Design a protein around this nucleic acid. Structure first.
Ligand SMILES: [Mg+2]
Ligand SMILES: [Mg+2]
Ligand SMILES: [Mg+2]
Ligand SMILES: [Mg+2]
Ligand SMILES: [Mg+2]
Ligand SMILES: [Mg+2]
Ligand SMILES: [Mg+2]
Ligand SMILES: [Mg+2]
Ligand SMILES: [Mg+2]
Ligand SMILES: [Mg+2]
Lengths: 62, 46, 362
RNA sequence: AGCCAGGAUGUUGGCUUAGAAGCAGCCAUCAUUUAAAGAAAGCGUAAUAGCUCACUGGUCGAGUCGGCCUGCGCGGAAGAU
RNA sequence: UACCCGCAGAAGAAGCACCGGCUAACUCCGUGCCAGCAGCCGCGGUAAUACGGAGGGUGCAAGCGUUAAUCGGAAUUACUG
RNA sequence: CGCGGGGUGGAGCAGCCUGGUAGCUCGUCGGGCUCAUAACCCGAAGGUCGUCGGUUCAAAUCCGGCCCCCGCAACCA
RNA sequence: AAAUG
């Protein structure tokens, strides 16, 4: 299949073991899946402070 | 960074030209706010 | 002496710019580490390494040395400027001027080498402009670009020649090929290869909407067409043998058929059309030559294919400039240099972009 | 012809080169201390270094050197009962 | 063990989603069809309550979101209808 | 290798037929037509006749050489 | 007579 990569910037490349979750992208032809940010080889999105759950971003400890 | 997967297959002569004749470098036409293709059924916040 | 002062002022600025582009501190550091490596007596035991390191060192040293020379010379000139002005000693002033000139020349030389370090940079080029997906608007944009390029080339002293022009059915051009002859023509233009972004309200659109149209420039140097070299009989195996089916008494005996084989490559050409062996060989020879030529062409093509594939890999990065006419601002995406004089740029003030690009090395 | 000795100085001539110190070349090819010593003929080096040579001093004590002309020979010269 | 009594001191103990419309909750800055968002409709091309951050708010709460899964809405297989 | 035919602007064709003369269709350029493009209308330009020699006063044209193309023929054992 | 944007 083909799966969308949400968020600004990703560490992904060839032979990268990833988790996909489902959910189709209306714009993209044939895309039926979203990759899960913050699971397996896929990293969380950098510098996010809101909606972090969706993007695998840990709590900014202060 | 990520590679762009062009819809040109196997480029033989010139890459730039091929890219130009691709969806990547398609024309972007603004939708009118006033004038011709200007009518909005529902507003952005309505 | 006001012009001299102005020149002095300029020179420091350009030196600073050069340093910025070079990344001077890093270079200095590299030179230092390499120097340290050099004096260690164990490094000359490995010969291949050592020569390479030496090669690396020298250029770096030159870069560094020239840079501070520039820093010092300017300062000296400034010091002597005062003397020229207030004390009114003429000979000293003249000397200072001479020194400045020398320094300027040196700077130019350094910048020259930084710029035109590539192999084909001195040669003349074919600039190829192609209109995009837009339509009439795109064609117009392409035409505009072509015009701009022509203006630029005339400006510095290059000879333009419109080789091929495909004209737009409504307005502008569909495609154009321009031969640009002159000293370091390709080196000056090679940076302009890429897709150009026009943003303006279309005059050809009936609605009058603001369009984002694209058009590609493609600069390639006029390579010298190498002579197709004569293959040596040492590289060749010539077999002679009897023909298939044949048909007669003299045919059964005679070995007219010729098999020519290239030893380095492994290509074969057979010929048995003629009765005469010699004639067959000649024909076979010709065939072999043709095959070799074809192989050469194929190899050339394959390499070329690799190159663009790599170029394709950059994708959206082939977009080099953005010509916004509505907000009145031109931006080079590669360097980051911006100007609000859009009309001036269109007329042919590309020097500001081009030079910076060259300095960058992109 | 052997044999024993020296075979230097300015000097590593500059340049262009990654380096070039007789020997990568490009080019000049000088003068010096003089018995004689090429800004170098070969080997050698990352390049120097190093090892030879040219010419010269000493020993030794009679012929010697290499061109020309010709005579006769040698190699070049491998095949199938 | 449950349970009860005493001891000390606010002490050791709050997050998650969302805020264009559906759908409860809006502004400023940053970005400029880019980056990105999105369940649908669509948002973004230099004043974005739709992107990202902040302040303010709303809903849930030791959970809160996302995905998958079934029924519902869907009278959209209608026996009722 | 032999016998023929050819090479004439961007293109495709003529003329070469007994040497002096450069034509047709399309294309190119400038107008006009349309809101614009196409079509259509008007007006122009553009050829060292593959190349090198030869002979007539004179060569696209005749003759020869060379380069390129297209046919044909390249056979009997 | 009259094709297209
Ligand atoms: Mg003999
Ligand atoms: Mg509301
Ligand atoms: Mg804003
Ligand atoms: Mg929303
Ligand atoms: Mg937002
Ligand atoms: Mg039902
Ligand atoms: Mg023709
Ligand atoms: Mg006639
Ligand atoms: Mg017209
Ligand atoms: Mg005539």
């Amino acid at each position: 299949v083909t799966s969308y990569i949400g968020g600004e910037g990703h560490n992904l490349q060839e032979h990268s073991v990833i988790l996909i979750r489902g959910g189709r992208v209306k714009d993209l032809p044939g895309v039926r899946y979203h990759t899960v940010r913050g699971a397996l080889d896929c990293s969380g999105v950098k510098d996010r402070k809101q909606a972090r759950s969706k993007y695998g971003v840990k709590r900014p400890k202060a | 960074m990520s590679r762009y997967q062009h819809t040109k297959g196997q480029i033989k002569d010139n890459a730039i030209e091929a890219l130009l004749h691709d969806p990547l470098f398609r024309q972007r036409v603004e939708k009118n706010k006033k004038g011709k293709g200007s009518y909005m059924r529902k507003g952005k916040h309505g | 002496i006001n012009p001299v002062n102005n020149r002095i002022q300029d020179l420091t600025e350009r030196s600073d710019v050069l340093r910025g582009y070079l990344d001077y501190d890093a270079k200095k550091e590299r030179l230092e580490e390499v120097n340290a490596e050099l004096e260690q007596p164990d490094v000359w035991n490995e010969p291949e390494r050592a020569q390479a390191l030496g090669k690396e060192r020298s250029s770096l040293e030159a870069v560094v040395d020239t840079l501070d020379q520039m820093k010092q010379g300017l300062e000296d000139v400034s010091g002597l400027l005062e003397l020229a002005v207030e004390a009114d000693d003429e000979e000293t002033f003249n000397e200072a001027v001479a020194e400045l000139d020398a320094l300027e020349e040196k700077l130019a030389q350094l910048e020259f080498r930084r710029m035109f370090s590539g192999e084909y940079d001195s040669a003349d080029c074919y600039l190829d402009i192609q209109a995009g997906s837009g339509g009439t608007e795109a064609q117009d944009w392409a035409s505009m670009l072509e015009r701009m390029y022509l203006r630029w080339a005339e400006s510095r002293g290059f000879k333009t020649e419109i080789i091929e022009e495909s004209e737009g059915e409504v307005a502008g051009i569909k495609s154009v090929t321009i031969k640009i002859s002159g000293d370091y023509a390709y080196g000056w233009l090679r940076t302009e290869t890429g897709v150009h972004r026009l943003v303006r309200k279309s005059p050809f659109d009936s609605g009058g909407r603001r369009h984002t149209s694209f058009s590609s420039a493609f600069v390639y140097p006029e390579v010298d067409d190498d002579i197709d070299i004569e293959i040596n009989p040492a590289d060749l195996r010539i077999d002679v043998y009897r023909t298939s089916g044949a048909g007669g008494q003299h045919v059964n005996r005679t070995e007219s058929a010729v098999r020519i084989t290239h030893i380095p490559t492994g290509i074969v050409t057979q010929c048995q059309n003629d009765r005469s062996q010699h004639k067959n060989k000649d024909q076979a020879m010709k065939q072999m030559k043709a095959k070799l030529y074809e192989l050469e062409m194929q190899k050339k093509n394959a390499e070329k294919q690799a190159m663009e594939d790599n170029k394709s890999d950059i994708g959206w990065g082939s977009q080099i400039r953005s010509y916004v006419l509505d907000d009145s601002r031109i931006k080079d995406l590669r360097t980051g240099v911006e100007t609000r004089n859009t009309q001036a740029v269109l007329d042919g003030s590309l020097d500001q972009f081009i030079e910076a690009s060259l300095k960058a090395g992109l």
